[PDB]
């Protein structure tokens, strides 16, 4: 890897088929600057602060992203068709903060090897699902040309109850529940 | 059957600008197969795959590309990252516990940028036996968090210190246990 | 290559003028820009995948579509009098330029009543006896007078032959009625040229009118374009 | 303001050089330089990303960092009239495509022997048809403007025979006015 | 006048059709 006081990675585009699923994204310093969300064509920042000040034309990317859907078209000939390996992901759950009992909490749950970018991460407690609360960034690169991605959850902290962030893939023949709890 | 493009532009600046390098990777599946390297100057195949690729995008683009790297990257630094990023400073939240020999696992957590010093102290003195750290802990809001332990065992009257050191404080944060 | 049409239109303030393009350069980008009173081209729309138009500069009051790739229509639904300008259609690939290819503009004009629209009246002035003598060279002088709209293109025919040089012909028309517009330009051949009987000077002007599309009434002969002459022979 | 052209519009005679500014106000990704002529074609003369170019009598320049881009043309011709554009690449807001708003470049023709005549010609298919061309004189100076109605008059135009330095300057009038002789209008000039 | 962000540009390879 190179070395450097920082780096940017601007334009960072990824497209795949079939489905027409791509994303295009900023980091800096390793950070997600902002997404674009194709669909509704809106440069979706990953912090608020940033998108007041200064900002960034949602058509800078949304031209990558039509460059990236031709490339692969012919790529994907050139390479008589070589499908993508699937590769298994690595869940790492943990709180964000200081654990302390019913002090409001967050529990991020950090996806890496990830590929395709094609994945269904959600949370569970006490063996039944949650919905509120649950945020989740978009995929971040790797410098192998992978993914990682991570999944907040808000929480109060409860030594009753047992979570599990439950990872879906086509490289999983089965989902993947990563147990956490207070208890240990 | 699934198949994917990617593509990644790189930007390293060290010493701030006066050192810029711009990288640039057109990848098929997770296979890098050509690569701009501002070192190099020009475009370099990297896999049989885009072997005459390279001809092509050095024809066709390799002007622009090469200023891309002022016109990108020194502008995107010096524009809209030192006003933005780089401003930001984030202190910490230090707070010493107790484990499950015994251990004082001292966590420090939401900070930014990541450069930090976690010292720990036994009555006014510097320890560096016994005492563990993590690996600077990212987590994704811009934040950053690491738990420094300390394995001792507790006499009544004895005092501790956790000695926290960032760019965000002007005075170095110390935490005191009994 | 990219090629419009049409090349020059004259409509009514609120018809729907629909100009197209058409470029065989397997470009994915088009653009449709306008070139307003010499202050420089403005984008209006553009398109980088087949059937999605993106806004331009001043996209207000127009409609783009870009049906296949090699297609890429702009359209006035209500034409207004502001919208009288020239609509250059360039195209590229990848990302501009070194490869973007302009057109070759398109002169749109946009009157309140059609009834204006009115032909030139070309005619010819011989050269004076005094310049072919004192100077050895005859000037043949060429006016365009009582024409709508401002639109209409001057050329010269030494021997049925088009010819460049030693003519200059007027850029800008010169407005004098409110429907009516006059331009001139001239010619310049060696005394001894002027002289054999056997050349022949034509002058060449062409109106850009109506076409069949448009309603013409009874009474009047239809404005339409065309060809308008004028000619001389040599003599001594 | 995007991008800005200077001058707005110059003159200049043969041989003579002279160079057109194009400062920024952001930092832009490729500039390119154009020159519509009389027949009203954009025609490239530079696509620049950096540093400069040269082709023949033309030479341009391009700093992203300094934000402007200029033109100098060395020996001046006659084809080289005909309005200029700088374009330069948005990367920010789109990629847009910014133009200037165009330089008028007239370059004059330097006579040496002139002669200023005017001449009355007359339309052998109308009889009361009679025109005014006034000929053969020098760049430096100023046509005549028409202020009343009826009378009118064009501006300089300049031409050119292959023979040898045909270069003659020239304008034209006439009227729906009684009948008022050649000098009667021109008078601000020379021989009749 | 306030500044705005650019973003790396990834370009066509040549096709035909
Ligand atoms: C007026 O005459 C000109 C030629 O004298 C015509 O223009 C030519 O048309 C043919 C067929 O399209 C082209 O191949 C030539 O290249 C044209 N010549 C020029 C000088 O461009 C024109 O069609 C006539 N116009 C009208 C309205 O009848
Ligand atoms: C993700 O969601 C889809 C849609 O319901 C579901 O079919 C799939 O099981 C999930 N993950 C996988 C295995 O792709």
Redesign the pocket.
Known sequence: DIEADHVGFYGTTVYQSPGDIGQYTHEFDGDELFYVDLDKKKTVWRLPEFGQLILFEPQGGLQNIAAEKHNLGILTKRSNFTPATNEAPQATVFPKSPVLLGQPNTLICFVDNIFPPVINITWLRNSKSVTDGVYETSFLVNRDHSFHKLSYLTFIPSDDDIYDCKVEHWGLEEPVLKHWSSAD | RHFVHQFKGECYFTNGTQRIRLVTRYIYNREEYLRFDSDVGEYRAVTELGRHSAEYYNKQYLERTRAELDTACRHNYEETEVPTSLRRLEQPNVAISLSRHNTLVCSVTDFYPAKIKVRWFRNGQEETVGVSSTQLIRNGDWTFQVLVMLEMTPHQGEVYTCHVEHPSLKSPITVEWS | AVTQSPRSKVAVTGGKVTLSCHQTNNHDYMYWYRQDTGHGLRLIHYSYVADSTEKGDIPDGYKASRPSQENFSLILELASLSQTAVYFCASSWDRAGNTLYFGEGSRLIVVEDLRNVTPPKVSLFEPSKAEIANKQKATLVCLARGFFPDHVEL?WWVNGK?VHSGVCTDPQAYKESNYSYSLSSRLRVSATFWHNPRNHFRC?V?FHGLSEEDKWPEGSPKPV???ISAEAWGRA | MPVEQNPPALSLYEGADSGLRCNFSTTMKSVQWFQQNHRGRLITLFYLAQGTKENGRLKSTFNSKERYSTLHIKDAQLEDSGTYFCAAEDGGSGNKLIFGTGTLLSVKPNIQNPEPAVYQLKDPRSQDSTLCLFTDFDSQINVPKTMESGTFITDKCVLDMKAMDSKSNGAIAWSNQTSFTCQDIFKETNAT | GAMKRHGLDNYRGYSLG
């Open positions: 050329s088009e060449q062409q374009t065309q060809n």
